A paper describes a structure:
Cytoplasmic linker-associated proteins (CLASPs) are excellent candidates to promote MT growth because they are well known to increase MT abundance and stability in mitosis and interphase. CLASP1α and 2α consist of three TOG-like domains (termed TOG1, 2, and 3) and a C-terminal domain responsible for interactions with CLIP-170 and other partners, CLIP-interacting domain (CLIP-ID) (Akhmanova et al., 2001, Al-Bassam and Chang, 2011). Mammalian CLASPs encompass three TOG-like domains, TOG1, TOG2, and TOG3, none of which bind to free tubulin. CLASPs suppress catastrophes by stabilizing growing microtubule ends, including incomplete ones, preventing their depolymerization and promoting their recovery into complete tubes.
To understand why TOG1 does not bind to free tubulin, we solved its structure by X-ray crystallography. The structure of TOG1 showed a conserved TOG-domain fold, but also demonstrated that the conserved residues required for tubulin interaction are lacking. This explains why TOG1 does not bind to either free tubulin or MTs. We also checked whether TOG1 could bind to alternative tubulin structures, such as tubulin rings induced by dolastatin or vinblastine, but found this not to be the case. We confirmed that the binding of TOG2 and TOG3 to stabilized MTs was weak, while TOG1 and CLIP-ID did not bind to MTs at all, and none of these domains interacted with free tubulin. Strikingly, the deletion of this domain (which converted CLASP2α to the equivalent of the naturally occurring splice isoform CLASP2γ), strongly diminished the ability of CLASP2 to suppress catastrophes, in agreement with a previous publication (Yu et al., 2016). To explain these results, we hypothesized that CLIP-ID has an auto-inhibitory activity that can be relieved by TOG1. Addition of this construct potently increased the anti-catastrophe activity of all TOG2-containing CLASP2 constructs that lacked TOG1 but contained CLIP-ID. These results suggest that CLIP-ID, when it is not bound to partners such as CLIP-170, has an inhibitory effect on TOG2, and possibly also on TOG3, while TOG1 can relieve this inhibition. Thus, in contrast to a previous publication suggesting that the ability of TOG1 to bind free tubulin is required for CLASP activity (Yu et al., 2016), we establish that TOG1 has an autoregulatory function. TOG1 is present in CLASP1/2α but absent in CLASP2β and CLASP2γ isoforms (Akhmanova et al., 2001).
Author numbering: 5 to 35, 41 to 229
């Protein structure tokens, strides 16, 4: 079976058959894919739709298939990053823990295998303002993981800080706390110049004092 075949199958109106279609595609990926670039794009497009699904089995299966496409395409997946990242930001807001986790894992995989971490972050940073509080928390958690896996050298820290500053004021404690963890982890990697930066961000004084208390407690 071929790409023409899978392109048609993943676009079926009958969603009920997505798991069966997906399993076949997964086996196929594991085993031309790139003989028609248009068809490859339409297939990835459709699977990005599957990631959207409220059925966790389908969203997970879409994530697995996209992950397999990343394994086989590497930097040739770059053209799909924009739309995949939008879907991933939404998915990080999913009610189901495993789904949120697999969404985050794929985002990190893009930074490892498809394009430099900052290229991904230029798109991913849009998620900081998403109107799902779980998505907002997830973007912060991605930043922490990015530092844990790739370090701070690949990123332009000054473009990420202002987003965290907004999230210090979030309506949810879990989002504020994740943003705080993220800024403190930036501090761990970059050092005292992060304090210098944070004085120029318009942060209210009592909040800034609180952030610097967290910095003082960085290893205590």
């Amino acid at each position: 079976r071929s790409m023409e075949y899978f392109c048609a199958q993943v676009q079926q109106k009958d969603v009920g058959g997505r798991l069966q279609v997906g399993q076949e595609l997964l086996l196929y990926l594991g085993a031309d894919l790139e003989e028609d670039l248009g068809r490859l794009g339409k297939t990835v497009d459709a699977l990005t739709g599957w990631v959207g699904s409220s059925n966790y089995r389908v969203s997970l299966m879409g994530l697995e298939i996209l992950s397999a496409f990343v394994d086989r395409l590497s930097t040739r997946f770059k053209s799909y990053v924009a739309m995949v990242i939008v879907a991933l930001i939404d998915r990080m807001g999913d009610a189901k823990d495993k789904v949120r986790d697999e969404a985050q894992t794929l985002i990190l995989k893009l930074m490892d295998q498809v394009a430099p971490p900052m290229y991904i972050w230029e798109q991913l940073a849009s998620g900081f303002k998403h109107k799902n509080f779980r998505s907002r928390e997830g973007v912060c958690l991605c930043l922490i993981e990015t530092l844990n896996i790739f370090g701070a050298q690949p990123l332009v820290i000054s473009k990420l800080i202002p987003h965290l500053c907004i999230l210090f004021g979030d309506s949810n404690s879990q989002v504020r706390d994740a943003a705080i963890l993220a800024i403190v982890e930036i501090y761990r990697h970059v050092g005292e110049k992060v304090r210098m930066d944070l004085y120029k961000r318009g942060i209210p004084p009592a909040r800034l004092e609180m952030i610097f208390a967290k910095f003082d407690e960085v290893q205590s």
